[PDB]
Amino acid sequence: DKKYSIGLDIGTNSVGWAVITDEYKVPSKKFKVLGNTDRHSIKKNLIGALLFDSGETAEATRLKRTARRRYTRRKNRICYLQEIFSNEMAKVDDSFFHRLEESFLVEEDKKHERHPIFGNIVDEVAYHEKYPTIYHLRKKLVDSTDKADLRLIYLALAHMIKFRGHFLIEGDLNPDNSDVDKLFIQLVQTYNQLFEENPINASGVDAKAILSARLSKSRRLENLIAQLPGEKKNGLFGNLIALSLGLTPNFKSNFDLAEDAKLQLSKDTYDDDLDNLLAQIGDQYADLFLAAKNLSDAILLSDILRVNTEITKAPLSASMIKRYDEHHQDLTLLKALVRQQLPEKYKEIFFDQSKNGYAGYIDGGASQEEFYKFIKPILEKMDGTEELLVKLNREDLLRKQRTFDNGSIPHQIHLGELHAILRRQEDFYPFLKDNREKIEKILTFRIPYYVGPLARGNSRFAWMTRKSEETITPWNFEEVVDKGASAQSFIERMTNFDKNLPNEKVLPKHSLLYEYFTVYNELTKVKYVTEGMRKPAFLSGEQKKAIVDLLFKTNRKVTVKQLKEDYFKKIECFDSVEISGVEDRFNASLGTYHDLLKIIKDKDFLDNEENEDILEDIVLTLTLFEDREMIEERLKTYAHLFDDKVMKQLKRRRYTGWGRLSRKLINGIRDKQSGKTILDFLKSDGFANRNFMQLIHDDSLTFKEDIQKAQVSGQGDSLHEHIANLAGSPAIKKGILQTVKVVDELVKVMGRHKPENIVIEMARENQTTQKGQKNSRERMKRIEEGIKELGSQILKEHPVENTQLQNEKLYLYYLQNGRDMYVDQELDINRLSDYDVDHIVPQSFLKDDSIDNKVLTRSDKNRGKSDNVPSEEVVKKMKNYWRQLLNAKLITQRKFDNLTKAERGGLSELDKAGFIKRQLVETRQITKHVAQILDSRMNTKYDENDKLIREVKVITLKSKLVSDFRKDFQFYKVREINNYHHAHDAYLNAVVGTALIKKYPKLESEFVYGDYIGKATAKYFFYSNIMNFFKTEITIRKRPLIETNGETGEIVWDKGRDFATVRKVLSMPQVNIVKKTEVQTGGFSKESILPKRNSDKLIARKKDWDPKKYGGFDSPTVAYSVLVVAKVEKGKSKKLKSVKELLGITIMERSSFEKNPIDFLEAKGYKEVKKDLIIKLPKYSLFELENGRKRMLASAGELQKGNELALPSKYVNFLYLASHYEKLKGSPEDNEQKQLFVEQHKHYLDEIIEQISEFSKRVILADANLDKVLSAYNKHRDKPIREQAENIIHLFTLTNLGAPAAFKYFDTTIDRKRYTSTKEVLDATLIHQSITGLYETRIDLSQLG
RNA sequence: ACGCAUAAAGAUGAGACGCGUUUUAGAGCUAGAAAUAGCAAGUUAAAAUAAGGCUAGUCCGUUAUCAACUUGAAAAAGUGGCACCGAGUCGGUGCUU
DNA sequence: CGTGATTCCAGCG
DNA sequence: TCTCATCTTTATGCGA
DNA sequence: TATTGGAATCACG
Ligand SMILES: [Mg+2]
Ligand SMILES: [Mg+2]
Ligand SMILES: [Mg+2]
Ligand SMILES: [Mg+2]
């Protein structure tokens, strides 16, 4: 019958809980201990923390699942090709495909000859000599005309199909449009054919070198214009050249068409704009544009390949052959030079695989970059290596055909090569002639992103709808899959429902109705004051309509200046007026109205409200679909209203994004006694002038009743089901469920009585208006100021709008002044999606995708950077540019440090020593959901008028309040001492929340969940000053010792005892720390495929691949260990010996074991096991052995420390002060006093060490490490107090709970002492802990046997 | 608690690239009895890329769930007095059952 | 000849 | 690494 | 608001 409160400190990887009473005292209770041990009752305090492994996001699972799908579909492509070829291959060589399938097997396991292709040694050797690589074969098949062996044709086609390339570029890059000079000559001839007055003569100009140079587009244009005698860059030929290279030219000046008619070949609107231009003049110039298109295709081909393609139809194969030949020549030259000049290193370079030489480059794991790093000093220290050095600096020395940078090759190249092979060989083999389209489709077919997995209802990820029930081959995908329905479901399965009407779907963000709702909602709360008016008055419905018609429907954005002058000064004839409710510009805007008015050029069509449904359907279609086919098909129904050009313009426009409200809410429902929708009320509410929130929360209005009727959907769900149904990442579910479970356990412990208050520490914050606005400035402002300070002209070259900067690649392009950050080059603005957003710190090392860890760079450069920080060479080359950007504030100091990390060593392990920025977001949303769940679950009873009775007030305390409470009353928190700080944080949150809701009841609306100089500054100052009643001496002001309730008589705070009570609570030794036992799930083992070795720790990669001959995985992950007491066979006679041991069922064996434990154990060797004496021990199972020493089971063969060091609060405060945590943030008097306190308490350090020492003599039992730490401490006694305190904070890692870790005390480094022996725990006391740790069951394992 | 505008950090799903690794194939030669030594060669390909499963799909297989005990196919339900004095991981005293 | 100390490693753009 | 899409939390600013 | 287990190798009483 004693009232109590529960304080919670939630985190991503920890949940601290505390129970307090009226006097802020944590109760102590006797809990019964179940089990067979003699211990039966234990006294425990109602405070503690729950520790669990962080909930992982589904990112890795999704990536692996997508990889699995891609592998399955690649094998299916190869299977389709084999099915096509099988009929003729059986005539040629029946077992060829069988040999290809079984090539992996060892000689004896093979059912055929070991040679896969030809089946005999001589032919295989001859083939390998004639075609050293596959690319030689591809080049030969493309170029040769004689009949080729069908096996070679299949090999080439299978190589092309298996590795087809990227699909980033749309359309078809005709390989025959390869020559640049010939197409340029054709363009010149076509230009001169109709323009004989001033013919263009470009003879003797090396067009290929000039246009296909590595310089920038503008530089190449200028070079070509200069080489053109008497031609103009802005001329018609100049504009055609600019279009061909990539620049978007203005054709208005060339023909004086009075319209710009800008033509960018990259844009898909190029064709329609060209049709417009033809309508301006005629089709006589069309051949010129066709020649320009061909020249552009040739230029792009040369850029992506950079090879002489004038003699072959397979430019990629020719490039690879040239690369192979140059590799061979350079290798021979390097061998000769090493033999002549540095013979003793020859064996190191060409034989030692362990090194990074050529032997390590080919046979070893050394990459191209590492090989260049190793070989450059040797190359420079020699003679006759000029060409080798030039190649090395160009990254074209001893290259491989299959490298990292092949990812920039479009699939059109392989498509053209495959088409050439088929055309060459179709006459000899008729089945190639009649199956050309089949194989080309196999190469080019790719499931649309909106269709997803092609399941038959057995997949939780599939959404496609099948028109006909049939197997989906790539050749009938168009006839079996309902693409329109699939795309509609793809969009709709992700978009959320309206909160007020959960059955309805939200409107598109750019929908006309949504924009009208936003504009009217913002406008209806505007007050105007003119001379002669006593008070501000709301805008009337007539005035609001006039404003909308005059200002919003004409100007894209309406500023207060226009409203004050265009309307009030002119229409209303008001000389002066003051406007309140809008700061500078109306946030809402009729953007869609202006876009559609420009598209259709019909004011009356949009103004009329009869066709409002038509516009809503138009915007819905433009939002749902992106493919022009589906959009055109949907808009066909409305084609009669508009015209053909208007229809094409509508097709071009594509909105994206969805709003937060439905159409049934904005304009669907109506008031019973008014017959006006919410939008109708917003347009003209009369003198009341209510807005949306007042409308749906008005009792006189009937909208609230309808919302209540529609919101009865959610009832009768279990807690697990409720958590699972929550939208968001599955990472936060673990934390939310654990918090709710510990709250329920605490309620159960206190005799089923609900807590009076539940105070939760929440990551909210309050900032001053200046700081808040300066961190919320639009990125356009940042890039504008950076460009202005940098002195660049990129903004004038390519003007941008703040909306367009939402695209990450464009934003990074502008942030980097348009130039690459890893090489001294210039990025192409139009041709994005060829560069990569590289994480400066590799994504495999640390999870950080902030703007301070992203750089837009060349794809090949990024991929060569690989799993590393940018190399020292890149840092040296680009440090000046990085500093220039840093001075212009285009990049932050953190980004500069990330870029120049290579100078300060490499990726040290300590770099992974800070909190991830993802953890803060996870904590925020975990706390939000926890508050919602607790408020909904605790308060269930409703009043007579259906009003919830707040029996359990949920308070959301901001972390700053508790942090200041700690920093003001010497309750300092040191995170490294132990895990008690979570429980202490929870207790302090409870205390502060209870005190604040006691002394200041009027603050309940601001702290209790439910009801609720700029405003931010006012709230910041208010929150800072609220906690002043805790202070004894303000600033000097001495408030009374015992704080009164205020307007009532209560003891809200008593500084004489309450501080003492809190100090006593924070120094309690017994705090219930629980490590949640988790069954390990995830990958079966390490993904690395180890080579063949005679070891039984290897796991076979297939059931028929014995690891003694094929290698395989190792290091399996143990799902949970199993305590088994049984009999094993010992000796040759195999006598039965009784043994008790842990087995460690791995993840891969978990299903087999759980299906039949006895048979599995007997297979493992143990005999006469007991199905009842088998004990399932998950990871982190707790065993108490002796002297209170606790070990947590980490696996079948390793233990973790399971004890917490209860350091007294005085030592913790001394460590916090001496270490200068957060430097010194006190007044000079207080800083001097604290420094004197530290100096007078030097001896504490010794005592602190003693503590740790004695702890390590009782629990840790690490003799060598403890002796090393003592020796280091004795060595560093003469150091200053600050360094010693910091290094002792480091030293506390020895006695922390969890897996042992290695630490550093000054210079000395102490490695981790691992307890790789689980023999002891077999004769210890296993402890099953409830989620709060209060309820325990102790099992004496020594009694088992 | 919510709607807009701006921003920062994140999340979820789909379609695709490029590598990497494993085993085999690409007859290594000579001197050697061998141990080995000298020389030549090196760039490519096939297959696998969680074992695997039944629902046989161009599907699914690494997120989420999980203290012990009792009842249960599961879902889920149930199981553990209090007060006070103290405190090195909780101990003691009284009451009560 | 088991056992404690030590070293090395971990699929990725 | 690329392409496409949809969500969340938090901060500031207007309005209840 | 955080954070290592598997495996091999070697000294050595
Ligand atoms: Mg916290
Ligand atoms: Mg498979
Ligand atoms: Mg990268
Ligand atoms: Mg905490």
SS (H, E, C) A813-860: HHHCCCECCCCCCECCCCCCCCEEEEECCCCCCCCCCCHHHEEEEEHH
**Residue A566 sits in the same domain as residue A682:** yes
Question: Do residues A1137 and A1154 make contact, with C-beta atoms less than 8 angstroms apart?
Answer: no
- Sign of the Cα torsion A804, A808, A811, A813 reads negative
- CA–CA separation, A771 vs A765, rounded Å? 12
Task: Please give the sequence-ordered ranges of beta strands (E in DSSP) within A613-753, or none if there are none.
Answer: 658-662
- CA–CA separation, A919 vs A917, rounded Å? 5
Question: Do residues A355 and A365 make contact, with C-beta atoms less than 8 angstroms apart?
Answer: no
A139 touches strand C (CB under 7 A): no
**Can you give the distance from the CA of residue A1298 to the C1' of nucleotide B37 in angstroms?**
55
Residue A1276 annotated as binding?
Answer: yes
Place of tokens 């640049």: A180
Ligand nearest to the CA of A959: 1
Tell how many helices (H) and how many strands (E) occur in chain A: 57, 30
**Residue A531 sits in the same domain as residue A678:** yes
A1087 touches strand C (CB under 7 A): yes
**Can you give the distance from the CA of residue A458 to the C1' of nucleotide B60 in angstroms?**
8
Nearest to A6 by CA among A1068, A722, A1063, A744: A744
Cross-strand pairs, A1176: A1122
Locate breaks in chain A with C to N over 2.5 A; list the residue preceding each: 1012, 1035
Question: Do residues A512 and A619 make contact, with C-beta atoms less than 8 angstroms apart?
Answer: yes
**Residue A752 sits in the same domain as residue A783:** no
- Sign of the Cα torsion A723, A724, A730, A731 reads positive
Bridge-based pairing state of the strands A1051-1054 and A1042-1044: antiparallel
Using the mean position of ligand 1's atoms as its centre, give its distance from the Cα of residue A18 in Å: 13
- CA–CA separation, A310 vs A318, rounded Å? 11
- CA–CA separation, A599 vs A529, rounded Å? 38
**Residue A152 sits in the same domain as residue A39:** no
Could you tell me if residue A1345 is inside a domain? Answer: no
Kindly list the strands in the beta sheet with A527-530, ordered across the sheet, starting from the edge strand earlier in the chain: A537-538, A527-530, A577-580
**Residue A572 sits in the same domain as residue A696:** yes
Nearest to A13 by CA among A47, A44, A41, A55: A55
Ligand nearest to the CA of A963: 1
A29 touches strand C (CB under 7 A): no
- Sign of the Cα torsion A745, A750, A756, A761 reads negative
**Which two structure tokens, joined as six digits, stand for A344?**
């003793």
Place of tokens 């598209």: A599
- CA–CA separation, A717 vs A305, rounded Å? 60
Within 7 Å of a protein beta carbon, the nucleotides of strand D are: 1-16
Domain boundary among A905, A934, A969: A905
Could you tell me if residue A1175 is inside a domain? Answer: no
**Residue A1068 sits in the same domain as residue A1206:** no
- Give me the amino acid identity at A162: K
Kindly list the strands in the beta sheet with A757-762, ordered across the sheet, starting from the edge strand earlier in the chain: A953-958, A757-762, A5-10, A14-20, A47-51, A1072-1075
Using the mean position of ligand 2's atoms as its centre, give its distance from the Cα of residue A96 in Å: 22
Question: For residue A776, how many other CB atoms are within 10 A of its CB?
Answer: 8
**Residue A979 sits in the same domain as residue A1059:** yes
A408 touches strand D (CB under 7 A): no
A940 touches strand C (CB under 7 A): no
Using the mean position of ligand 4's atoms as its centre, give its distance from the Cα of residue A846 in Å: 23
- CA–CA separation, A480 vs A471, rounded Å? 8
Task: Please give the sequence-ordered ranges of beta strands (E in DSSP) within A52-203, or none if there are none.
Answer: none
- CA–CA separation, A990 vs A980, rounded Å? 16
Q: What is the SS3 assignment for A942?
A: strand
**Residue A254 sits in the same domain as residue A295:** yes
Question: Do residues A1265 and A1299 make contact, with C-beta atoms less than 8 angstroms apart?
Answer: no
**Can you give the distance from the CA of residue A223 to the C1' of nucleotide C3 in angstroms?**
76
- CA–CA separation, A1002 vs A988, rounded Å? 21
Question: For residue A233, how many other CB atoms are within 10 A of its CB?
Answer: 18
**Which two structure tokens, joined as six digits, stand for A144?**
């040769």
Catalytic residues of A: 9, 839
Using the mean position of ligand 4's atoms as its centre, give its distance from the Cα of residue A1074 in Å: 14
A153-182 per-residue burial string, b: 16 or more CB within 10 A, e: under 16: bbbbbbbbbeebbeeebeeebebebbbbbb
A1263 touches strand C (CB under 7 A): yes
**Can you give the distance from the CA of residue A532 to the C1' of nucleotide B64 in angstroms?**
66
Resolution (A): 3.0
A930-966 per-residue burial string, b: 16 or more CB within 10 A, e: under 16: bbebbbebbbeeeeeeeeeeeebbbbbbbbbbbebbb
Report the Cα–Cα distance between both ends of chain A, in Å, rounded: 47
Question: For residue A817, how many other CB atoms are within 10 A of its CB?
Answer: 22
Nearest-CA residue to the C1' of B80? A32
**Which two structure tokens, joined as six digits, stand for A461?**
């990820």
A58-97 per-residue burial string, b: 16 or more CB within 10 A, e: under 16: eeeeeeeeeeeeeeeeeeebbebbbebbeeebeeebeebb
- Sign of the Cα torsion A125, A126, A128, A134 reads negative
The phi and psi torsions of A249 (rounded to 5 degrees) equal: -95, 160
DSSP characters over A699-722: SSSSHHHHHHHHGGG--S--HHHH
Could you tell me if residue A400 is inside a domain? Answer: yes
Residue A1307 annotated as binding?
Answer: yes
The answer for A389, left when phi > 0, alpha when psi is -120 to 50, beta otherwise, is: alpha
Question: Do residues A514 and A474 make contact, with C-beta atoms less than 8 angstroms apart?
Answer: no
Residue A93 annotated as binding?
Answer: no
Place of tokens 């460590």: A1215
**Can you give the distance from the CA of residue A283 to the C1' of nucleotide B83 in angstroms?**
102
**Residue A758 sits in the same domain as residue A787:** no
Write the CA distances from A1057 to A348, A1061, A1062, A1213, integer angstroms: 77, 6, 9, 20
- CA–CA separation, A802 vs A814, rounded Å? 11
Task: List CB contacts of A287: < 8 A, sequence separation 6 or more.
Answer: A190, A193
Nearest to A1124 by CA among A1179, A1170, A1191, A1184: A1170
- CA–CA separation, A495 vs A499, rounded Å? 12
CA A1005-A1007-A1012 angle, to 5 degrees, is: 35
Task: List CB contacts of A571: < 8 A, sequence separation 6 or more.
Answer: A546, A550
Please give all residues whose CB falls under 5 A of ion ligand 3, grouped by chain where several chains appear. Answer: A 838, 862
What size, in residues, is chain A? 1345
DSSP characters over A1184-1223: E-STT-EEEEEETTEEEE-------HHHHHHHHHHTTTTS
Which nucleotide is closest, CA of A496 to its C1'?
D7
Count the domains in chain A. 7
Q: What is the SS3 assignment for A281?
A: coil
**Residue A825 sits in the same domain as residue A747:** no
The answer for A1075, left when phi > 0, alpha when psi is -120 to 50, beta otherwise, is: beta
Could you tell me if residue A213 is inside a domain? Answer: yes
Could you tell me if residue A332 is inside a domain? Answer: yes
**Four-point Cα dihedral A1296, A1302, A1303, A1309, nearest 10:** 150
- CA–CA separation, A1264 vs A1288, rounded Å? 18
**Can you give the distance from the CA of residue A519 to the C1' of nucleotide B4 in angstroms?**
9
Question: Do residues A554 and A548 make contact, with C-beta atoms less than 8 angstroms apart?
Answer: no
A110-139 per-residue burial string, b: 16 or more CB within 10 A, e: under 16: beeeebbbbbeeeebeebeeebebbbbbbb
**Residue A658 sits in the same domain as residue A577:** yes
- CA–CA separation, A369 vs A404, rounded Å? 11
DSSP characters over A758-781: EEEEE------HHHHHHTS--HHH
Which nucleotide is closest, CA of A844 to its C1'?
C12
A772 touches strand C (CB under 7 A): no
Write the CA distances from A884 to A247, A779, A819, A1286, integer angstroms: 27, 19, 12, 36
**Can you give the distance from the CA of residue A913 to the C1' of nucleotide E3 in angstroms?**
7
A908 touches strand D (CB under 7 A): no
Could you tell me if residue A986 is inside a domain? Answer: yes
Q: A1233: number of CA atoms within 13 Å, CB side?
A: 6
The answer for A792, left when phi > 0, alpha when psi is -120 to 50, beta otherwise, is: beta
Could you tell me if residue A1184 is inside a domain? Answer: no
**Residue A803 sits in the same domain as residue A743:** no
Nearest-CA residue to the C1' of B92? A43
**Which two structure tokens, joined as six digits, stand for A1304?**
């550093």
Within 7 Å of a protein beta carbon, the nucleotides of strand E are: 1-8
Bridge-based pairing state of the strands A1190-1195 and A577-580: unpaired
Place of tokens 């076509």: A190
A1302 touches strand C (CB under 7 A): no
Q: What is the SS3 assignment for A1028?
A: helix
Cross-strand pairs, A1201: A1191, A1298
DSSP characters over A446-505: ---TTT----SS--SS----BSSSS---TTSHHHHB-HHHHHHHHHHTTSPBPSSSTTSB
Domain boundary among A283, A305, A327: A305
HEC string of A857-883 equals EEHHHHHHHCCCCCCHHHHHHHHHHHH
Residue A9 annotated as binding?
Answer: yes
Could you tell me if residue A1127 is inside a domain? Answer: no
Domain that holds residue A1247: 1200-1323
Domain boundary among A1024, A1051, A1075: A1075
CATH code: domain of residue A1025: 3.30.420
